[PDB]
Amino acid sequence: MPYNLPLPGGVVPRMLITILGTVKPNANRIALDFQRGNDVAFHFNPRFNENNRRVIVCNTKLDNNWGREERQSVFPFESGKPFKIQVLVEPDHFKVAVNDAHLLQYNHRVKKLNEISKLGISGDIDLTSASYTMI
């Protein structure tokens, strides 16, 4: 939707990625796509209305096939409101916090973290900034 944050050197433990923005009015979806070639190592997809239920769907795409979805009902996003998403990389999983509160963790399926060269940021949001640092 369709911005891309380059991750030279790929993903590595201790890396902290921060995304700041504002959810658009009447938002329908948001998506973060950690890409490794044509695969999607980590797909973070907040859905504002899936049968009148809000849900965050996470999955991985390998060789054009989506794997086992990991769903989370806790949904801190709100249409028209600013947000902050922080993705902390651990050797065994991606740690996600929103508005400074832990939200979920997604265990790595794609093991070669170094090959995850970019983070796609899309969906119904107004992007302020996307950056990363080491902690």
Ligand SMILES: OC[C@H]1O[C@@H](O[C@H]2[C@H](O)[C@@H](O)[C@H](O)O[C@@H]2CO)[C@H](O)[C@@H](O)[C@H]1O
């Ligand atoms: O898993 C992430 C992936 O989901 C796709 O939609 C799924 C839907 O969530 C699932 O309930 C249904 O059984 O199959 C659909 C197709 O795989 C999204 O289209 C895709 O963009 C990702 O969000």
